[PDB]
Design an enzyme around this catalytic site. Structure first.
Site, PDB file in Angstrom:
ATOM      1  N   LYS A 103       2.544  -7.622  15.154  1.00  0.00           N
ATOM      2  CA  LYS A 103       2.764  -6.297  14.593  1.00  0.00           C
ATOM      3  C   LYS A 103       3.810  -5.571  15.422  1.00  0.00           C
ATOM      4  O   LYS A 103       3.939  -5.802  16.626  1.00  0.00           O
ATOM      5  CB  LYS A 103       1.472  -5.478  14.548  1.00  0.00           C
ATOM      6  CG  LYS A 103       1.430  -4.468  13.422  1.00  0.00           C
ATOM      7  CD  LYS A 103       1.099  -5.144  12.110  1.00  0.00           C
ATOM      8  CE  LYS A 103       1.445  -4.257  10.938  1.00  0.00           C
ATOM      9  NZ  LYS A 103       0.897  -4.793   9.664  1.00  0.00           N
ATOM     10  N   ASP A 143       6.764  -2.926   6.234  1.00  0.00           N
ATOM     11  CA  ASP A 143       5.515  -2.177   6.296  1.00  0.00           C
ATOM     12  C   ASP A 143       5.751  -0.727   5.895  1.00  0.00           C
ATOM     13  O   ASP A 143       6.747  -0.425   5.231  1.00  0.00           O
ATOM     14  CB  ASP A 143       4.886  -2.265   7.684  1.00  0.00           C
ATOM     15  CG  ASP A 143       3.375  -2.263   7.632  1.00  0.00           C
ATOM     16  OD1 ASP A 143       2.819  -1.988   6.550  1.00  0.00           O
ATOM     17  OD2 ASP A 143       2.741  -2.542   8.666  1.00  0.00           O
ATOM     18  N   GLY A 217      -5.953   3.712  -8.778  1.00  0.00           N
ATOM     19  CA  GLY A 217      -4.631   3.650  -8.162  1.00  0.00           C
ATOM     20  C   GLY A 217      -3.724   2.851  -9.074  1.00  0.00           C
ATOM     21  O   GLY A 217      -4.012   1.715  -9.447  1.00  0.00           O
ATOM     22  N   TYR A 218      -2.600   3.463  -9.443  1.00  0.00           N
ATOM     23  CA  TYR A 218      -1.666   2.850 -10.379  1.00  0.00           C
ATOM     24  C   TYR A 218      -0.274   2.733  -9.775  1.00  0.00           C
ATOM     25  O   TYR A 218       0.728   2.939 -10.463  1.00  0.00           O
ATOM     26  CB  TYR A 218      -1.618   3.630 -11.690  1.00  0.00           C
ATOM     27  CG  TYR A 218      -1.276   2.778 -12.886  1.00  0.00           C
ATOM     28  CD1 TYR A 218      -2.135   1.778 -13.316  1.00  0.00           C
ATOM     29  CD2 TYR A 218      -0.097   2.976 -13.588  1.00  0.00           C
ATOM     30  CE1 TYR A 218      -1.826   0.998 -14.409  1.00  0.00           C
ATOM     31  CE2 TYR A 218       0.218   2.201 -14.681  1.00  0.00           C
ATOM     32  CZ  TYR A 218      -0.649   1.214 -15.087  1.00  0.00           C
ATOM     33  OH  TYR A 218      -0.337   0.441 -16.176  1.00  0.00           O
ATOM     34  N   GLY A 219      -0.195   2.404  -8.489  1.00  0.00           N
ATOM     35  CA  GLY A 219       1.085   2.155  -7.858  1.00  0.00           C
ATOM     36  C   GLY A 219       1.605   0.778  -8.209  1.00  0.00           C
ATOM     37  O   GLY A 219       1.366   0.289  -9.316  1.00  0.00           O
ATOM     38  N   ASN A 220       2.318   0.140  -7.283  1.00  0.00           N
ATOM     39  CA  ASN A 220       2.775  -1.223  -7.524  1.00  0.00           C
ATOM     40  C   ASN A 220       1.592  -2.170  -7.686  1.00  0.00           C
ATOM     41  O   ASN A 220       1.478  -2.885  -8.692  1.00  0.00           O
ATOM     42  CB  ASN A 220       3.677  -1.676  -6.376  1.00  0.00           C
ATOM     43  CG  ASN A 220       4.414  -2.961  -6.684  1.00  0.00           C
ATOM     44  OD1 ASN A 220       5.230  -3.017  -7.603  1.00  0.00           O
ATOM     45  ND2 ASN A 220       4.133  -4.004  -5.914  1.00  0.00           N
ATOM     46  N   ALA A 221       0.675  -2.153  -6.715  1.00  0.00           N
ATOM     47  CA  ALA A 221      -0.446  -3.084  -6.726  1.00  0.00           C
ATOM     48  C   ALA A 221      -1.363  -2.835  -7.916  1.00  0.00           C
ATOM     49  O   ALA A 221      -1.740  -3.771  -8.623  1.00  0.00           O
ATOM     50  CB  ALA A 221      -1.226  -2.982  -5.417  1.00  0.00           C
ATOM     51  N   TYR A 223      -0.822  -1.173 -10.856  1.00  0.00           N
ATOM     52  CA  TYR A 223      -0.196  -1.426 -12.150  1.00  0.00           C
ATOM     53  C   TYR A 223      -0.019  -2.917 -12.388  1.00  0.00           C
ATOM     54  O   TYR A 223      -0.312  -3.421 -13.480  1.00  0.00           O
ATOM     55  CB  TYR A 223       1.150  -0.712 -12.244  1.00  0.00           C
ATOM     56  CG  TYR A 223       2.100  -1.360 -13.226  1.00  0.00           C
ATOM     57  CD1 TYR A 223       1.877  -1.279 -14.593  1.00  0.00           C
ATOM     58  CD2 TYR A 223       3.214  -2.061 -12.786  1.00  0.00           C
ATOM     59  CE1 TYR A 223       2.737  -1.872 -15.493  1.00  0.00           C
ATOM     60  CE2 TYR A 223       4.079  -2.657 -13.679  1.00  0.00           C
ATOM     61  CZ  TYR A 223       3.835  -2.560 -15.031  1.00  0.00           C
ATOM     62  OH  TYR A 223       4.695  -3.152 -15.926  1.00  0.00           O
TER      63      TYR A 223
HETATM   64  N1  NDP Z   1       1.554  -3.235  -3.017  1.00  0.00           N
HETATM   65  C1  NDP Z   1       1.652  -4.191  -1.944  1.00  0.00           C
HETATM   66  O1  NDP Z   1       2.693  -4.823  -1.806  1.00  0.00           O
HETATM   67  C2  NDP Z   1       0.517  -4.415  -0.985  1.00  0.00           C
HETATM   68  C3  NDP Z   1      -0.467  -3.436  -1.034  1.00  0.00           C
HETATM   69  N2  NDP Z   1      -1.477  -3.185  -0.027  1.00  0.00           N
HETATM   70  C4  NDP Z   1      -2.556  -2.264  -0.303  1.00  0.00           C
HETATM   71  O2  NDP Z   1      -2.659  -1.884  -1.595  1.00  0.00           O
HETATM   72  C5  NDP Z   1      -2.816  -0.624  -2.075  1.00  0.00           C
HETATM   73  C6  NDP Z   1      -1.693  -0.103  -2.950  1.00  0.00           C
HETATM   74  O3  NDP Z   1      -0.446  -0.622  -2.594  1.00  0.00           O
HETATM   75  P1  NDP Z   1       0.832   0.101  -3.118  1.00  0.00           P
HETATM   76  O4  NDP Z   1       1.125  -0.332  -4.565  1.00  0.00           O
HETATM   77  O5  NDP Z   1       2.030  -0.234  -2.197  1.00  0.00           O
HETATM   78  O6  NDP Z   1       0.591   1.661  -3.077  1.00  0.00           O
HETATM   79  P2  NDP Z   1       1.578   2.681  -3.747  1.00  0.00           P
HETATM   80  O7  NDP Z   1       2.067   3.693  -2.686  1.00  0.00           O
HETATM   81  O8  NDP Z   1       2.794   1.965  -4.385  1.00  0.00           O
HETATM   82  O9  NDP Z   1       0.830   3.512  -4.867  1.00  0.00           O
HETATM   83  C7  NDP Z   1      -0.326   4.225  -4.531  1.00  0.00           C
HETATM   84  C8  NDP Z   1      -1.159   4.438  -5.779  1.00  0.00           C
HETATM   85  O10 NDP Z   1      -2.468   4.822  -5.442  1.00  0.00           O
HETATM   86  C9  NDP Z   1      -2.530   6.186  -5.804  1.00  0.00           C
HETATM   87  N3  NDP Z   1      -3.241   6.963  -4.803  1.00  0.00           N
HETATM   88  C10 NDP Z   1      -2.867   7.355  -3.444  1.00  0.00           C
HETATM   89  N4  NDP Z   1      -3.946   8.096  -2.952  1.00  0.00           N
HETATM   90  C11 NDP Z   1      -4.936   8.138  -4.006  1.00  0.00           C
HETATM   91  C12 NDP Z   1      -6.138   8.723  -4.029  1.00  0.00           C
HETATM   92  N5  NDP Z   1      -6.636   9.448  -2.895  1.00  0.00           N
HETATM   93  N6  NDP Z   1      -6.824   8.620  -5.070  1.00  0.00           N
HETATM   94  C13 NDP Z   1      -6.515   7.995  -6.179  1.00  0.00           C
HETATM   95  N7  NDP Z   1      -5.274   7.344  -6.278  1.00  0.00           N
HETATM   96  C14 NDP Z   1      -4.491   7.465  -5.075  1.00  0.00           C
HETATM   97  C15 NDP Z   1      -1.143   6.683  -6.032  1.00  0.00           C
HETATM   98  O11 NDP Z   1      -1.098   7.717  -6.943  1.00  0.00           O
HETATM   99  P3  NDP Z   1       0.225   8.508  -7.230  1.00  0.00           P
HETATM  100  O12 NDP Z   1       1.204   7.606  -7.931  1.00  0.00           O
HETATM  101  O13 NDP Z   1      -0.054   9.686  -8.122  1.00  0.00           O
HETATM  102  O14 NDP Z   1       0.841   8.989  -5.939  1.00  0.00           O
HETATM  103  C16 NDP Z   1      -0.552   5.499  -6.629  1.00  0.00           C
HETATM  104  O15 NDP Z   1      -0.979   5.387  -7.931  1.00  0.00           O
HETATM  105  C17 NDP Z   1      -2.956   0.060  -0.753  1.00  0.00           C
HETATM  106  O16 NDP Z   1      -4.273   0.297  -0.443  1.00  0.00           O
HETATM  107  C18 NDP Z   1      -2.328  -0.892   0.247  1.00  0.00           C
HETATM  108  O17 NDP Z   1      -2.863  -0.736   1.498  1.00  0.00           O
HETATM  109  C19 NDP Z   1      -1.139  -3.966   1.116  1.00  0.00           C
HETATM  110  C20 NDP Z   1      -0.576  -5.183   0.913  1.00  0.00           C
HETATM  111  C21 NDP Z   1       0.757  -5.236   0.254  1.00  0.00           C
HETATM  112  N1  GGL Z   2       2.652  -6.296   6.863  1.00  0.00           N
HETATM  113  C1  GGL Z   2       2.682  -6.811   5.499  1.00  0.00           C
HETATM  114  C2  GGL Z   2       3.752  -7.895   5.359  1.00  0.00           C
HETATM  115  C3  GGL Z   2       3.198  -9.311   5.305  1.00  0.00           C
HETATM  116  C4  GGL Z   2       3.502 -10.103   6.561  1.00  0.00           C
HETATM  117  O1  GGL Z   2       2.980  -9.740   7.635  1.00  0.00           O
HETATM  118  O2  GGL Z   2       4.264 -11.090   6.472  1.00  0.00           O
HETATM  119  C5  GGL Z   2       1.322  -7.361   5.086  1.00  0.00           C
HETATM  120  O3  GGL Z   2       0.460  -7.509   5.953  1.00  0.00           O
HETATM  121  O4  GGL Z   2       1.134  -7.637   3.901  1.00  0.00           O
HETATM  122  O1  AKG Z   3       0.125  -2.502   6.050  1.00  0.00           O
HETATM  123  C1  AKG Z   3       0.286  -3.086   4.956  1.00  0.00           C
HETATM  124  O2  AKG Z   3       0.456  -4.321   4.863  1.00  0.00           O
HETATM  125  C2  AKG Z   3       0.275  -2.263   3.691  1.00  0.00           C
HETATM  126  C3  AKG Z   3      -0.376  -0.912   3.970  1.00  0.00           C
HETATM  127  C4  AKG Z   3      -0.225  -0.021   2.760  1.00  0.00           C
HETATM  128  O3  AKG Z   3       0.404  -0.404   1.789  1.00  0.00           O
HETATM  129  C5  AKG Z   3      -0.834   1.306   2.762  1.00  0.00           C
HETATM  130  O4  AKG Z   3      -1.440   1.693   3.784  1.00  0.00           O
HETATM  131  O5  AKG Z   3      -0.732   2.019   1.742  1.00  0.00           O
END
Ligand code: NDP
Ligand code: GGL
Ligand code: AKG
Length: 417
Positions: A103, A143, A217-221, A223
């Site tokens: 890290k 990250d 949660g409808y972000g990248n993960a 959705y």
């Molecule tokens: N996506 C990835 O590549 C990976 C993801 N993770 C884990 O996955 C999860 C999501 O990833 P990621 O797509 O990057 O996140 P994003 O930042 O892209 O999107 C966050 C989503 O969750 C919503 N959100 C944030 N806070 C809340 C809350 N308190 N209540 C309800 N909805 C909330 C956001 O809403 P809004 O759009 O309105 O802001 C949005 O829809 C995280 O927990 C992360 O730690 C880790 C590994 C890699």
């Molecule tokens: N820190 C990110 C990137 C992945 C990696 O460490 O290669 C994760 O844990 O998903």
């Molecule tokens: O640390 C990571 O690998 C992702 C963490 C993240 O996406 C978050 O905290 O929202």
């Protein structure tokens, strides 16, 4: 206030309490094997020079080169970096990658830095930590507040310093496709979650075709999880949510239309044909798969009992508390541990590193199939440990990861017991 490293050590001791591990191995695993703290000086746009604090923690490398991301947060601390490296060790060990734990981090607010200043920061960080990183020593990754652009800058600086004497593309992952990038990186986490959900349904004997799934949660993960569920698993998406709120429709949701509406109205709320619900209310719905892909600790002891989902796919990073873990296990509900469900991202980063090292790059189908194999094997190993040891799924995953690391340590001769 519950120091992150203290929490990680407590977690490790808890995991060791469920398995046969020597005291010397536990003491070795309680301490990172190498911590590097460096000063990162850059030239500001006004001509001044500012020095930032950078970290690079390598927790353990018994299984191979350490893997982990770099955080750019104003609240970064060495304790947080150490805890995240410790967690990354188990994350790469549970899914059987030839990696250790690593890290990095810089104590900086990137919202106040320009593009040139950010590039200078990345290059200076590489210049500072070059002596402890490499294609076969330590592979950084994206990250929080860090993106593939910074990956490209870091890779270019590393290649410049290394004088092109080897696979400089493989020193860092998450790079743009033009320079050593990999296919499938966008949907890695969701694809891994979908494979784990399919395997969980197979283990429970439930046919997902025609079932219901709710995603928080409808972000990248979130959705991509909903879209891939509907596409491959044939599961009806009935509820999605954002920070603002959530929506519900028993007849089903189209993820593309919901994404379009969110990208047009700024939120998923007020979607046509859907009833507005709260996040808490979404956790209450009677579904067969629940996928929290949002903020930490959304399932607590308060609402653990009122959950009606058959499978809870912890797509996010720890959305279930230990008390909620015990309550949910008592209700006969299978949980997929957080660092096993979202292990697709690190697995795809490993695939990218393999492609860079080999000089040969795969396609979308090959990456998808290899990820499928890795996630299926990891979930089946964790579930078999869960069934044999009669412990929680999270405890089983911790046991598997710590056992792999301990066996690697014993094979090297690091620990004699
Ligand atoms: N996506 C990835 O590549 C990976 C993801 N993770 C884990 O996955 C999860 C999501 O990833 P990621 O797509 O990057 O996140 P994003 O930042 O892209 O999107 C966050 C989503 O969750 C919503 N959100 C944030 N806070 C809340 C809350 N308190 N209540 C309800 N909805 C909330 C956001 O809403 P809004 O759009 O309105 O802001 C949005 O829809 C995280 O927990 C992360 O730690 C880790 C590994 C890699
Ligand atoms: N820190 C990110 C990137 C992945 C990696 O460490 O290669 C994760 O844990 O998903
Ligand atoms: O640390 C990571 O690998 C992702 C963490 C993240 O996406 C978050 O905290 O929202």
């Amino acid at each position: 206030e519950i120091d992150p490293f203290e929490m990680a050590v407590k977690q490790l001791e808890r995991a060791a309490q469920y398995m046969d591990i020597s005291e010397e191995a536990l003491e070795w695993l309680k301490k990172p094997m190498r911590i590097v703290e460096v000063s990162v000086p850059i030239e500001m746009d006004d001509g001044s020079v500012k020095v930032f604090t950078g970290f690079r923690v390598q927790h353990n490398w018994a299984r191979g080169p350490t893997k982990g991301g770099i955080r750019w947060h104003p609240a970064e601390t060495l304790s947080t970096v150490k805890a995240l490296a410790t967690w990354m060790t188990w994350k790469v060990a549970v899914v059987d990658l030839p990696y250790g734990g690593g890290k990095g981090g810089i104590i900086v607010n990137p919202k106040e830095l320009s593009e040139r200043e950010q590039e200078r920061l990345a290059r200076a960080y590489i210049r500072a930590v070059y002596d402890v990183i490499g294609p076969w020593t330590d592979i950084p990754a994206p990250d929080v507040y860090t993106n593939p652009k910074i990956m490209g800058w870091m890779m270019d600086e590393y290649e410049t310093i290394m004088r092109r004497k080897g696979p400089a593309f493989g020193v860092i992952t998450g790079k743009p496709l033009s320079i050593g990038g990999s296919l499938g990186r966008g949907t890695a986490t969701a694809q891994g979650a979908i494979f784990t959900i399919r395997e969980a349904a197979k283990a429970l004997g439930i046919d997902l075709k025609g079932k219901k799934i709710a995603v928080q949660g409808y972000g990248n993960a979130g959705y991509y999880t909903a879209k891939l569920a509907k596409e491959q698993l044939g599961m009806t998406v009935v509820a999605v949510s954002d920070s603002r709120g959530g929506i519900y429709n028993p007849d089903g949701l189209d993820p593309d239309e919901v994404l379009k509406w969110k990208r047009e109205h700024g939120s998923v709320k007020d979607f046509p044909g859907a009833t507005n619900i709260t996040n808490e209310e979404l956790l209450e719905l009677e579904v067969d798969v629940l996928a929290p892909a949002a903020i930490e600790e959304v399932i607590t002891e308060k609402n653990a009992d009122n959950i009606k989902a058959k499978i809870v796919a912890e797509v996010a990073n720890g959305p279930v508390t230990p008390e909620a873990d015990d309550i949910l296990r008592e209700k006969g509900i299978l949980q997929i541990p957080d660092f096993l469900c979202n292990a697709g991202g690190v697995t795809v980063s490993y695939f990218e590193w393999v492609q860079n090292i080999n000089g040969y790059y795969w396609t979308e189908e090959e990456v998808r199939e290899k990820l499928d194999k890795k996630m299926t094997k990891a979930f089946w190993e964790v579930y078999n440990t869960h069934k044999d040891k009669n412990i929680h799924m999270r405890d089983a995953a911790y046991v598997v990861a710590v056992s792999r690391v301990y066996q690697a340590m014993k094979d090297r001769g690091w620990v004699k017991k």
